[PDB]
Design a protein around this ligand. Sequence first.
Ligand SMILES: *[C@@H]1O[C@H](CO)[C@@H](O[C@@H]2O[C@H](CO)[C@@H](O[C@@H]3O[C@H](CO[C@H]4O[C@H](CO[C@H]5O[C@H](CO)[C@@H](O)[C@H](O)[C@@H]5O[C@H]5O[C@H](CO)[C@@H](O)[C@H](O)[C@@H]5O)[C@@H](O)[C@H](O[C@H]5O[C@H](CO)[C@@H](O)[C@H](O)[C@@H]5O)[C@@H]4O)[C@@H](O)[C@H](O)[C@@H]3O)[C@H](O)[C@H]2NC(C)=O)[C@H](O)[C@H]1NC(C)=O
Length: 298
Amino acid sequence: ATYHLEDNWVGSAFLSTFTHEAIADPTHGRVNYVDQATALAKNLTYASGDTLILRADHTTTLSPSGPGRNSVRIRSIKTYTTHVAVFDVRHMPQGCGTWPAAWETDEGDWPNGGEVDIIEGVNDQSPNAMTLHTGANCAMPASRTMTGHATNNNCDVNTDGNTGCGVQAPTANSYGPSFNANGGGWYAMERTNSFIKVWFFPRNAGNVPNDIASGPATINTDNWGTPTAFFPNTNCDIGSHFDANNIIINLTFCGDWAGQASIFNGAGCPGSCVDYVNNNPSAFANAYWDIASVRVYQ
Ligand SMILES: *[C@@H]1O[C@H](CO)[C@@H](O[C@@H]2O[C@H](CO)[C@@H](O[C@@H]3O[C@H](CO[C@H]4O[C@H](CO[C@H]5O[C@H](CO)[C@@H](O)[C@H](O)[C@@H]5O[C@H]5O[C@H](CO)[C@@H](O)[C@H](O)[C@@H]5O)[C@@H](O)[C@H](O[C@H]5O[C@H](CO)[C@@H](O)[C@H](O)[C@@H]5O)[C@@H]4O)[C@@H](O)[C@H](O)[C@@H]3O)[C@H](O)[C@H]2NC(C)=O)[C@H](O)[C@H]1NC(C)=O
């Protein structure tokens, strides 16, 4: 479980090693995903020094008949199979209606190339969820060694209500306003032929592996303790359900998950998600990622 540095992305490096996906939102959110040039001009992406900011427009009041709220979805140019990805995240988007994610997939053959969601949630609702979405014949055992709590254990999007097989992180500060109040933290995901693991370490953790915290060129996941989420191959050939995946980091609003009235209102968010997103630009001033680095090891 020893790996060596493959990519080191800090600040302006993201502008040449990722693209912006100016696409209709696959999750049907109240979002307008802008291109890279537009993002940089409007300061929705800011990539300089040791900082990457990816943010929502927090100034425009939207025409209800016009496009959704400007935001960004960035995708690594490179693809990865067996690897470790480490995200040093100072801030993640918050606010009613927000649906941020840091994840990997192969968009071109989804879901057959797999999807792993590393950071994901909606409407400020902690804790973080870590989830696989696959094609047929991929499930997880009811009990396996991890610190998080399994929810759905069938990863097949065709037969699991499109939920994937998920794990909830054990602490509130894994996600949302709680995470942001704490200065964020580190997410690491190891993928091999035999498993996927995710670890979360809060910013203030006394037990964060130096491997993760300082980003040296050599790491050893054997020394990282029990993962937060564990997806073993007991009932899923992991390698046959995943192919070469890009890393994606995005922020959408409302849409198929966050926008459901019961879910949005259940989070303490008033009224209509789309109406809220249209008419409360200032409420998205804290709907930003602040990323110190993303590093991949192979
Ligand atoms: C487009 O959008 C961008 C992004 O939002 C806008 O940029 C912001 O612009 C505003 C206004 O100009 C800036 O506000 C100013 O900030 C000044 C201070 O900046 C310096 O410190 C910042 C905080 O750094 C600490 O915290 C971070 C973690 O969050 C640590 O990494 C860092 O080490 C610092 O830690 C110290 O403090 C903490 C406690 O707070 C301790 O625990 C630690 O031990 C340390 O003691 C920091 O964010 C700034 O970094 C920026 O600049 C440096 C180069 O100078 C660069 O390397 C970084 O990558 C980053 O770009 C900086 O070090 C302050 O003096 C002033 O009053 C005002 O508040 C704001 O900093 C900008 N944010 C950025 C750049 O991320 C931009 O304006 C907009 N463009 C437009 C309008 O055209």
